[PDB]
């Protein structure tokens, strides 16, 4: 199983959306679980969840790792208000297209800003909400902002690299000697084949300040069924978060692995594959 | 054989470290791995009365189960500590595993529990396999509770002035849903109580000779290499929520899961994701 | 100086304000510090400060304790909104009366929750912010809620005695044998003397459940200079909040006294009078 | 005299402890009560650099004021260390107490200086009055933040590779707002560094024998009398505010005071606030 290989592309018509193309990567029969990858240079589905869709699909799932807009091999765009809202658009539009009446959301970081936002509007498009150290969520109470990671990320967007985005990619594990060259070059090449998404991404977050993603005083209003998953060690979006998601989300429950970094699904991925499997088949 | 409080129940002499044919009364069933559970410290606390809707699930799962009663609780010998409990405790533990040929066992302990189960990964890091924890006590201040906790000292009054009305509100506050609550529980812990005067007085001049600060092994959890499993209720009133981050933080191999809606007993408020949570974790991690 | 003695009464119209009696104790001439007291009991301007007024004066200060509406000698009242919203219009309107331009705000609790609601409604009528364990705002990261001493608060509302009384104010100690008879005695009479106070609390509570009090998506906007205290030992409101205050206040600062229950300002009264006029005169 | 760094700088022989004629530099102006003020622990660090914005204030307030070089630093004697730095500190710090005859004497320390300040109070009860203290190293694990923080290890990697930009990056971090940063406070701490480079070898050298958790004192906390005055910077990336709280909670007489738009240096970058606040805790706390 691989990429190309899994690969697909579909136009999708959702709010404001004319004829928009999505690419993501699929496989397997089931009940749907949707995987939503994190906010950073060169980030897709692929990227984030190639540890995740095997023993995922090796479980009975019909599993897609979605390119959110203006990422990896979609469509560019520029957007003026929070990636969150805008990102989740385009899900219930993924699923209308392929013709999906609910799925599961598994959201890292922004992807779980976007899954999160999908729950608020697309109440009755959702099965279960599994958030991974998701972003947006307002200022930490003990972590100084913008965090370690966050400055790496936008470091990297203005002022693409390699000896940059490795940098930041150790800082995004734990045990920083589990890199890659299948992780490192992939990302390496989201990045060099799709410049434009830098420079959007920025102009962006010019128009939505990652403050204007802040769902929390909403987050009362989220009836779906939510596991959120964090490494100890996340530099990028803070732990105390985990436990703001706890005590707001009606049906939550919290996991935290340790000796491990912001990507709790690659570095972790064993014990995550298990423990969220094991929560959409039982919980 | 059926799985009944009294088809599983059985007794032990134990003759470590200054315990010498001291009895240890347990609840057994199911055969191979062994899992032993160590149950908390409130008045009328018994293995049973912890863990009888977690005990079922285990044994099916393929575990030997072992719910303990420690020393000085439930049916076990009576005893007035002049050391701390979970030191003690844990050498009962080493004791009844020597006495009953068992080299290594898993460990879930509840608060006084916990606290045990953590001496004894210390004391005997080669006959512990995996340990679990649910609120473990034994982990000093708190960075945001006010101590001693809600829960704590119910505890105490109900140890000083046993009355089946103050035994009620502290199981109440144990629970985050508090109708969960039935007669029987209550009349269980009571009859623990009235039928054994002697541990709750034990209990009190025990304390009193080490309190709970005493039971405190925060600067020694580096040395805890067991895989471990740490567990919160996210509601609870006994013990405070952050010293499960104390624990993911200080020891090596460890990882948390806190349940929302849930008091500090997640292992009966919350059994059966507990029961399923917990024994992936013993199969798989 | 003392209770009768500052013992002042006004009649005040703001909002939806016909002729409402409010009764203060005041002292002393300069810059207007009111002092807004906590939500239970029995509780006034004099019980909660008595402690702090005279300090506060012999140190060139205008000092009013304000009973807010509901409460020890002023007129009854039922609620439909939060009280703090409320609470607040009713300052606006001691200040209009008395004829006052600015205020310094002390606000404990129910008190605090007040001062934040005039910051945010009258953000021209206030001087400095101080803010003592002050209630409200959301749910804790760390304490379970109801707290011990809100679950003894609506116990002693709606089942008034003297046992239950003393029960909740060593409750609001650390050092529960400091405990005076004054300060019994004074909450045991204001209770006594207006039982249609308990009553109407509780059906206020019944419209606006306390949950209705959380400022926190709006404290962005607040421009006055705040200071935020608490008791290390605070059983009522929670630690961690003064944290959140901390972080949403453009311009806060954060003391906790340790071996202090609720109560900071009589508890820890000579630290808190010397901590307060040193931040009022030099802040 | 007008007040300067030099008219202000002087010597003195040490003889506590292993130390012998071991040379200390310090900073002293004013008379009376002393306040001896400890820096903290990165490349180029000494009393006058940490601390030339408190010295002229606590002085006019009827202070003694010594901001004193840790042996190591800036211009005290060199040394490697096998043992922890804040318990060699405070040696240090008796035996220049010694050699001037002060009895007792206020401590205000930084990071370093304030785990230095910690073992002092531990060590000579009797020698110390009260106890200042600005996000003290020396004291674990977080529960919130990743370790070793941000500053940490940019102070790590000035340490071994000195380079003027990544002191000037380091500094950043060590401010709320970077602005503030003058080119003649990095040209100090940049000379510092350049004329004092066994320093920095010897302090790497000393970490190996004795790393950083070794200077973790949080077992002994209980045993501190002196009243405890815990000062944080909100937006500290170099150690972590909840440790404020733990001190907080385990020292007897505590209190802490947090600023707000402020990094690490809350009595350089908010040092106005913080000598009024800090000499009023010395007249009448």
Same mark, same amino acid.
């Given at each position: ?77 520029? @957007? ?14 993924? @699923?209308?297209?392929?013709? #999906? ?39 930490? @109470?003990?972590?100084? @902002? ?60 010019? &128009? ?35 436990? &703001?998601?706890?005590?707001? #989300? ?34």
């Amino acid at each position: 199983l691989t990429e190309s290989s899994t690969s697909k592309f579909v136009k999708i018509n959702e709010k404001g959306f004319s004829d928009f193309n999505i690419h993501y990567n699929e496989a397997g029969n089931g009940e749907t679980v949707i995987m939503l990858h994190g906010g950073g240079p060169g980030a897709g589905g692929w990227s984030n969840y190639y540890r995740n869709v095997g023993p995922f699909v090796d479980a009975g799932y019909r599993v897609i790792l979605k390119d959110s807009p203006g990422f990896n091999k979609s469509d560019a765009v520029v @957007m003026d208000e929070q990636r969150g809202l805008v990102n989740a658009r385009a899900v219930k539009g993924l @699923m209308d297209a392929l013709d #999906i009446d609910r799925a599961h959301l598994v959201g890292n970081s922004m992807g779980g800003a976007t899954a999160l936002n999908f729950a608020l509007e697309y109440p009755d498009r959702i099965g279960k909400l599994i958030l991974m150290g998701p972003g947006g969520l307002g200022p930490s @109470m003990f972590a100084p @902002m913008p965090m370690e990671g966050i400055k790496l990320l936008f470091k990297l967007y203005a002022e693409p690299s390699y000896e940059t985005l490795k940098q930041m990619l150790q800082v995004f594990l734990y045990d920083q000697s589990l890199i890659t060259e299948e992780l490192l070059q992939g990302r390496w090449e989201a990045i060099q084949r799709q410049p434009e998404h830098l420079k959007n991404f920025l102009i962006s977050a010019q &128009k939505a300040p990652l403050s204007t993603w802040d769902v929390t005083a909403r987050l009362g209003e989220i009836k779906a069924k939510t596991f959120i998953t964090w490494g100890r060690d996340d530099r990028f979006v803070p732990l105390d978060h985990g436990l &703001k998601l706890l005590w707001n #989300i009606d049906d939550a429950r919290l996991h935290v692995f340790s000796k491990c970094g912001h990507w709790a699904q690659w570095e972790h991925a064993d014990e995550f594959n298990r423990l969220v499997i094991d929560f959409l088949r039982h919980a």
